[PDB]
Amino acid sequence: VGAXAXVXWXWXWXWX
Amino acid sequence: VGAXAXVXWXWXWXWX
Ligand SMILES: [Cl-]
Ligand SMILES: [Cl-]
Numbered sequence: 001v002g003a004x005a006x007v008x009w010x011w012x013w014x015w016x
Numbered sequence: 017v018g019a020x021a022x023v024x025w026x027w028x029w030x031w032x
């Protein structure tokens with residue numbers, strides 16, 4: 001859990 | 017729903 005690539009908040013594909 | 021900022025898959029804070 002923390003920063004880098006995976007699932008959660010930030011940039012990429014999903015909702016917003 | 018799509019690409020940009022928000023939640024889901026890609027780069028930022030959460031789970032790897
Ligand atoms: Cl797109
Ligand atoms: Cl942006």
Ligand SMILES: [Cl-]
Binds near residue numbers: 023
């Ligand atoms: Cl949120």
Ligand SMILES: [Cl-]
């Ligand atoms: Cl946190």
Ligand SMILES: [Cl-]
Binds near residue numbers: 006031032
């Ligand atoms: Cl994970």
Ligand SMILES: [Rb+]
Binds near residue numbers: 007010011024028030
């Ligand atoms: Rb993410």
Ligand SMILES: [Rb+]
Binds near residue numbers: 009
């Ligand atoms: Rb993300």
Ligand SMILES: [Rb+]
Binds near residue numbers: 013
């Ligand atoms: Rb997004």
Ligand SMILES: [Rb+]
Binds near residue numbers: 003004
């Ligand atoms: Rb991560």
